[PDB]
Scaffold this motif. Sequence first.
Motif, PDB file in Angstrom:
ATOM      1  N   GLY A   1      -3.089  -2.630   6.074  1.00 45.32           N
ATOM      2  CA  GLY A   1      -4.416  -3.212   6.141  1.00 45.32           C
ATOM      3  C   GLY A   1      -4.920  -3.666   4.788  1.00 45.32           C
ATOM      4  O   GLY A   1      -4.430  -4.648   4.234  1.00 45.32           O
ATOM      5  N   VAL A   3      -5.028  -1.382   2.183  1.00 43.29           N
ATOM      6  CA  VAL A   3      -4.308  -0.616   1.172  1.00 43.29           C
ATOM      7  C   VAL A   3      -3.192  -1.450   0.562  1.00 43.29           C
ATOM      8  O   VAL A   3      -2.884  -1.313  -0.628  1.00 43.29           O
ATOM      9  N   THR A   4      -2.571  -2.327   1.351  1.00 42.26           N
ATOM     10  CA  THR A   4      -1.603  -3.258   0.787  1.00 42.26           C
ATOM     11  C   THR A   4      -2.266  -4.176  -0.229  1.00 42.26           C
ATOM     12  O   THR A   4      -1.695  -4.461  -1.287  1.00 42.26           O
ATOM     13  N   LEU A   7      -2.791  -2.101  -3.419  1.00 45.24           N
ATOM     14  CA  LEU A   7      -1.548  -1.906  -4.156  1.00 45.24           C
ATOM     15  C   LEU A   7      -1.068  -3.198  -4.800  1.00 45.24           C
ATOM     16  O   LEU A   7      -0.465  -3.165  -5.876  1.00 45.24           O
ATOM     17  N   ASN A   8      -1.321  -4.342  -4.164  1.00 42.02           N
ATOM     18  CA  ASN A   8      -0.939  -5.608  -4.772  1.00 42.02           C
ATOM     19  C   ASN A   8      -1.850  -5.964  -5.938  1.00 42.02           C
ATOM     20  O   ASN A   8      -1.392  -6.559  -6.920  1.00 42.02           O
ATOM     21  N   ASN A  75       5.100   7.732  -1.628  1.00 39.06           N
ATOM     22  CA  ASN A  75       6.427   8.274  -1.852  1.00 39.06           C
ATOM     23  C   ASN A  75       7.027   7.617  -3.092  1.00 39.06           C
ATOM     24  O   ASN A  75       6.338   6.941  -3.858  1.00 39.06           O
ATOM     25  N   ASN A  77       8.630   5.053  -3.582  1.00 34.90           N
ATOM     26  CA  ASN A  77       8.839   3.613  -3.550  1.00 34.90           C
ATOM     27  C   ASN A  77       7.996   2.876  -4.577  1.00 34.90           C
ATOM     28  O   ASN A  77       8.252   1.697  -4.836  1.00 34.90           O
TER      29      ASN A  77
END
Lengths: 78, 51
Positions: A1, A3-4, A7-8, A75, A77
Amino acid sequence: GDVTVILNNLLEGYDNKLRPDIGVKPTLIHTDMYVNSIGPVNAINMEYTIDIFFAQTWYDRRLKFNSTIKVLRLNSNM
Amino acid sequence: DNTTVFTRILDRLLDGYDNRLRPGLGERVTEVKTDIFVTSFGPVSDHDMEY
């Protein structure tokens, strides 16, 4: 949603070769541990096995966002 | 030529996918249904107290 999107936005204009405050002040890192088991202490090699959960916490003014979510849980990633 | 349609399906699946976010990040608790099939119980090493 969203949160992507967060993070971007955190990784746009981010250089992971420069520590936070590279030319300002030292980075204070708080270190904790959790010794699960201290393995056999063999005297022949003067060594001993230990199994820990090493946790390091520091401040990074570049990974600073402002949204409804308070904490980002990720995690290995990122 | 099902290879092309399956390629398009896969590329639509991965278009806009974030592998850092668990499924149902907001409104669900992920349910991981595990299972094990022990093909061979290896030798229980008594010296190291391992198996």
